[PDB]
Write a protein that binds this ligand. Structure first.
Ligand SMILES: [Mg+2]
Ligand SMILES: [Mg+2]
Ligand SMILES: [Mg+2]
Ligand SMILES: [Mg+2]
Ligand SMILES: [Mg+2]
Ligand SMILES: [Mg+2]
Ligand SMILES: [Mg+2]
Ligand SMILES: [Mg+2]
Ligand SMILES: [Mg+2]
Ligand SMILES: [Mg+2]
Ligand SMILES: [Mg+2]
Ligand SMILES: [Mg+2]
Ligand SMILES: [Mg+2]
Lengths: 115, 206, 98, 153, 100, 84, 127
RNA sequence: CCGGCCGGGAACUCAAAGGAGACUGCCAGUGAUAAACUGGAGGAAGGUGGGGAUGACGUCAAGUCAUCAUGGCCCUUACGACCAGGGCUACACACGUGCUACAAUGGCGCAUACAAAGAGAAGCGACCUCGCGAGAGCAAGCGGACCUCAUAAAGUGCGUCGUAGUCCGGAUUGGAGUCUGCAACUCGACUCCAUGAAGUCGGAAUCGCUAGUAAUCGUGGAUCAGAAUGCCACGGUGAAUAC
RNA sequence: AAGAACCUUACCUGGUCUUGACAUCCACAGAACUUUCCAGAGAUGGAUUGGUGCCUUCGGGAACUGUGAGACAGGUGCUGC
């Protein structure tokens, strides 16, 4: 119930639980379970410690949690200090993939700031 | 309000098409452009001859142009020296062999296009538009049209406020689809601007 | 077998065409299977009518390609030449096939 | 409308029981034109309530409806300054429609799980005058009783 | 439209027809997958050197009677306005007002 | 982005300028308009004035811009903020 | 001998052949139970037979095309109705009083210009 | 070789032509013995059956000189023309019109049924092989009731989730990629992996709709090299209400 | 607006052209056409391999190109009062 250094829920099925690892979604969770030979509908608190060890080994293959976080952070910071268009967009906290900013863009710009 | 074209709303019902050539999506655009060019050239070169209608068919890599005209002698000329040149140029424009056939139009006074052209020519010549309209209506109702409506719109008589005036006699039931409403428009480029003439002629039913 | 595909923009005219097709193919001696009506292609177009704005003011036009099929099983030698010399009226496209 | 409606639309009685009353109930419960889902939910609720109680599905449904059906409602009339909440007696078709609608509103607003469970529980409560539906009927009758002075109209 | 605009379109059509074959060849090298890296590179460079107006994507359909770049209809080669006018005057075969 | 089968895209004239400038040493900034061109590995150290609509923004090419369009480092809009 | 009828509903067309037999109903080479998932559809198919009380003494061979489940069910119902019409004319009054002879002439209304659907106008605002 | 597959059949569904039908025609009552109305039979349809096209005289000196034509004025080493880059895609904000949601009438997984209408020749692209997928290779067939687009989805059967900002919800962003196009940075669509936001039904106010309509589910087309949640059509399921 | 990456595009920054990109008409020269090299962001300018014909009053015209003055051409410039 502690894979890649984080607590994962014991009450949920294995596929749903493994998605709690920052870096594993449904697809990677299914791949991990298949490679470790564990049913997709088994609940975490009902796996043998050997099975959890194998799961640890599998999830160790992929970059997750802190390593992934700092990888993403160094990619963003490289964009930043290069100061290309995407670096400038990231600095200003505006949409980065060519969306419209005349309206919407609330996810990047934050909620309404009245004048 | 605006009104539907008395020709278009009746094309499939009591009118014919001014073009009955069949072609597929590869040929439709080119044939339409060539028909437009031929009609434009014919009208420009036969402005004097009073060409009432131009029908175009394309049987098989050929173009047949029937020119319903009011002065067939004028458009043909001596023997056929004029229609021969017209056919040559039409064939050159269409890129295919041509065949021009002149059609007798009896009574230019019951044909909407010819009435409109006459009225526009008078307007260019600066005749009173009320007199031109009354003459047109009287001529048609004496030739025996069951009804006629004439409308002239624009800067009539050098006015600075454009207005629309229309005379009418008999019946012109534009809503009945089976009624024979021959309708046509023309423009008169006067020195005070453009003046639009529209003519409806109701000639009968089925 | 001889296959005649008649395409026209007018059902009355195409009916005239196919009638005289079958009359010629029967006077020549051969027997005919038809005419067969194949579905009309109703090509529809929608166009704004004002030169400026007014989006809800539209005309809807329609082009009805009518199509008839003529079959000539047992194609007589005179039948073939008669059909190919017949020369249909304008406004009809005829495709001849074997 | 200012003219008059023709006869009401024909309704095909539901297959399991052949009751147009239940057909109307299914239609009222239906959402986004998913009559299959509505019928399955209604049928599950009916069998569940029949099993919990003992009554036949149809008669138990009738009892639950009757405990919710109103008799007089209030409509608005204009004279001036204020409005009259005039009490008017209801016709039976509107009675059944209102009873069904109130039952379905209460069932949807209940906090259970499957809507069949919600509907069975709500109808069971109506079978002894407990649901939000019977509460709404209570409110309607006591409002009409309060406004009874305007009944003469 | 403008006479200059129509002239531009004519020039683009002429260049596309003139240089069509070479563009076809070079794009064949590029999208061929068993062509050497040197071949694909030189083909990219030569396709660059070919004039831009040769690209058939550079063209813009125009109403042949007015040059209008909007509202085109490929079946007729005209914009909506010209199609409406000709259709009502009967200068389009078979076409007539639809109702269904 | 560009399909990998087609490889990277460099405009021929900019490639010529770059190869000649690199083989003939440090020179004037490469005045160029090819914003759509790719920064190749042998681009380092070159100062290139990439057009942006009215100006030729100078860009000192370094290692970490390899594989990026030169037009990305020359912004084409001006913005400082509303009612500052 | 086989008695034939045609039913239509929405855009469904159902050819229905009836011949006296053991009460077997075949829809598109498939039994009714596993061809129609909706008990409403099964009721719709069997409605004329049960209302004329001839449910077991006829055999149905039916082929239907076009439409959806309910449209096809109505097409089947119309097909049996007409097949029994041309079987006997005596049950005509009963079937009309029931309301099965009538072909329900209700199609999907065409979409119109300036509306989102048949009648759903775009949302209007004074300003 | 269970596939109309082949021989065949012309019945049937369909395809397209031509006809018939519905007219207040008949009956009853009401009604100024009139128009007509309230019903009833018959009939597929009963009262202009449903829908569409059809927009009267005229009103707003309403809109368009940027489709076009056009009087008058104006520019003409130019206010015309050519070219490459950029912008029309900018964002403290405000409004309109929509899409997806806020979940269990649901989500996900597996199996499976039922459509109409349209398109297509530097076009639609089978089958097969490869790729996890966008797609790639070879490549038939078809200007077509033949071939392709193109397995409809909602629905049904089983399991799962068990009310939680959640297997809801999909924004945003990182990495890796496919296709079109000379070229995808400004500024494309799509795919895989990852991230997983706001949102728990929305104040005053306000909109659409009386039938196969609303609601809901998918499909096609025009424009188009690529680029729809828009627009225009098509069918599937399918109500409540009108005193 | 039935669909702005370049085009569209009418706007902006620069590089350029002015009887002009597109029309007639005047004269002269030259068949056109095709390919190739340089410079320039491209426009555009230098060249030039090949080509030098189609009818013929065989001498010239028909086309297609450049040049040379124009009469003009061009305007998505204003005015929908
Ligand atoms: Mg112009
Ligand atoms: Mg384009
Ligand atoms: Mg709209
Ligand atoms: Mg009328
Ligand atoms: Mg204005
Ligand atoms: Mg815009
Ligand atoms: Mg999800
Ligand atoms: Mg398409
Ligand atoms: Mg497209
Ligand atoms: Mg629909
Ligand atoms: Mg641009
Ligand atoms: Mg005005
Ligand atoms: Mg005004």
């Amino acid at each position: 119930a502690r894979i890649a250094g984080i607590n994962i829920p014991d009450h949920k099925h294995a596929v749903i639980a493994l998605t709690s690892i920052y870096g594993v979604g449904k697809t990677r969770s299914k791949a991990i379970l298949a490679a470790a030979g564990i049913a997709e509908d088994v609940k975490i608190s009902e796996l043998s410690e050997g099975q959890i060890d194998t799961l640890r080994d599998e999830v160790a293959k992929f970059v997750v949690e802190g390593d992934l976080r700092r990888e993403i952070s160094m990619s963003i910071k490289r964009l930043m200090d290069l100061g290309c268009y995407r670096g400038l967009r990231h600095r200003r906290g505006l949409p980065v993939r060519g969306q419209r900013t005349k309206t919407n863009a609330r996810t990047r710009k934050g909620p309404r700031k009245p004048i | 309000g605006q009104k539907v074209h008395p020709n278009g709303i009746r094309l499939g019902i009591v009118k014919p098409w001014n073009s009955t050539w069949f072609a597929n999506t590869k040929e439709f655009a080119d044939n339409l452009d060539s028909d437009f060019k031929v009609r434009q050239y014919l009208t420009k070169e036969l402005a004097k001859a009073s060409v009432s209608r131009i029908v175009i068919e394309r049987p098989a890599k050929s173009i047949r142009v029937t020119i319903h005209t009011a002065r067939p002698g004028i458009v043909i000329g001596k023997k056929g020296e004029d229609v021969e040149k017209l056919r040559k140029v039409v064939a050159d424009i269409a890129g295919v062999p041509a065949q021009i056939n002149i059609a007798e139009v009896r009574k230019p006074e019951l044909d909407a296009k010819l009435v409109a052209d006459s009225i526009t020519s008078q307007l260019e010549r600066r005749v009173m538009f009320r007199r031109a309209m009354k003459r047109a209506v009287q001529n048609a109702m004496r030739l025996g049209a069951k009804g006629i409506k004439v409308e002239v719109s624009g800067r009539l008589g050098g006015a600075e406020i454009a207005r629309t005036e229309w005379y009418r006699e008999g019946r012109v039931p534009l809503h009945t689809l089976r009624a024979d409403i021959d309708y046509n428009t023309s423009e008169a480029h006067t020195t005070y601007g453009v003046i639009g003439v529209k003519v409806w002629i109701f000639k009968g039913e089925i | 077998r001889i296959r005649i595909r008649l395409k026209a923009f007018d059902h009355r005219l195409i009916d005239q065409a196919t009638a005289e097709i079958v009359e010629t193919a029967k006077r020549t001696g051969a027997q005919v299977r038809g005419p067969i009506p194949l579905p009309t292609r109703k090509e529809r177009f929608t166009v704004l009518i004002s030169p400026h704005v007014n989006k809800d003011a539209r005309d809807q036009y329609e082009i009805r390609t009518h199509l008839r099929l003529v079959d000539i099983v047992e194609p007589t030698e005179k039948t073939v030449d008669a059909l190919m010399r017949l020369d249909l009226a304008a406004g009809v496209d005829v495709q001849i096939s074997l | 409308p200012r003219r008059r409606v023709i006869g009401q639309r024909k309704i095909l009685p539901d297959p399991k029981f052949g009751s147009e009353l239940l057909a109307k109930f299914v239609n009222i419960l239906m959402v986004d034109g998913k009559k299959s889902t509505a019928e399955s939910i209604v049928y599950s609720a009916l069998e569940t309530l029949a099993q919990r109680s003992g009554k036949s599905e149809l008669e138990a449904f009738e009892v639950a409806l009757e405990n919710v059906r109103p008799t007089v409602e209030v409509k608005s009339r204009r004279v001036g300054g204020s409005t009259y909440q005039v009490p008017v007696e209801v016709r039976p078709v509107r009675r059944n429609a209102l009873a069904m609608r109130w039952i379905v509103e209460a069932a949807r607003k209940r906090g259970d799980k499957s809507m069949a469970l919600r509907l069975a529980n709500e109808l069971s409560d109506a079978a002894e005058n407990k649901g939000t539906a019977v509460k709404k009927r209570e409110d309607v009758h006591r409002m009409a009783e309060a406004n009874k002075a305007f009944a003469h109209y | 439209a403008k006479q200059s605009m129509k002239a531009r379109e004519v020039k683009r059509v002429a260049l596309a027809d003139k240089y069509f074959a070479k563009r076809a060849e070079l794009k064949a090298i590029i999208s061929d997958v068993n062509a050497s890296d040197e071949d694909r590179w030189n083909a990219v460079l030569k396709l660059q050197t070919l004039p831009r107006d040769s690209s058939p994507s550079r063209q813009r359909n125009r109403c042949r009677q007015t040059g209008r770049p909007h509202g085109f209809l490929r079946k007729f080669g005209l914009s909506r306005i010209k199609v409406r006018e000709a259709a009502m005057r009967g200068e389009i075969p078979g076409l007539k007002k639809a109702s269904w | 982005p560009r399909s990998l089968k087609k490889g990277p895209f460099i405009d021929l004239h900019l490639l010529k300028k770059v190869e000649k400038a690199v083989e003939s040493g440090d020179k004037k900034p490469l005045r160029t308009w090819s914003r759509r061109s790719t920064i190749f590995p042998n681009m380092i150290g070159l100062t290139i004035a990439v057009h942006n609509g009215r100006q030729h923004v100078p860009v000192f090419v370094t290692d970490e811009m390899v594989g990026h369009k030169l037009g990305e480092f020359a912004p084409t809009r001006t913005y400082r903020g509303h009612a500052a | 001998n086989q008695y034939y009828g045609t039913g239509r509903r929405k855009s469904s067309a159902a050819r229905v052949f009836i011949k006296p037999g053991n009460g077997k109903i075949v829809i598109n080479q498939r039994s009714l139970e596993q061809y129609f998932g909706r008990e409403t559809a099964r009721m719709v198919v069997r409605q004329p037979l049960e209302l004329v009380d001839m449910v077991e003494k006829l055999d149905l061979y039916i082929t239907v095309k076009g439409g959806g489940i309910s449209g096809q069910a109505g097409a089947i119902r119309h097909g049996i109705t007409r097949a029994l019409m041309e079987y006997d004319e005596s049950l005509r009054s009963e079937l009309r009083k029931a309301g099965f002879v009538t072909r329900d002439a209700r199609q999907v209304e065409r979409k119109k210009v300036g509306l989102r659907k048949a009648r759903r106008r775009p949302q209007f605002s004074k300003r």
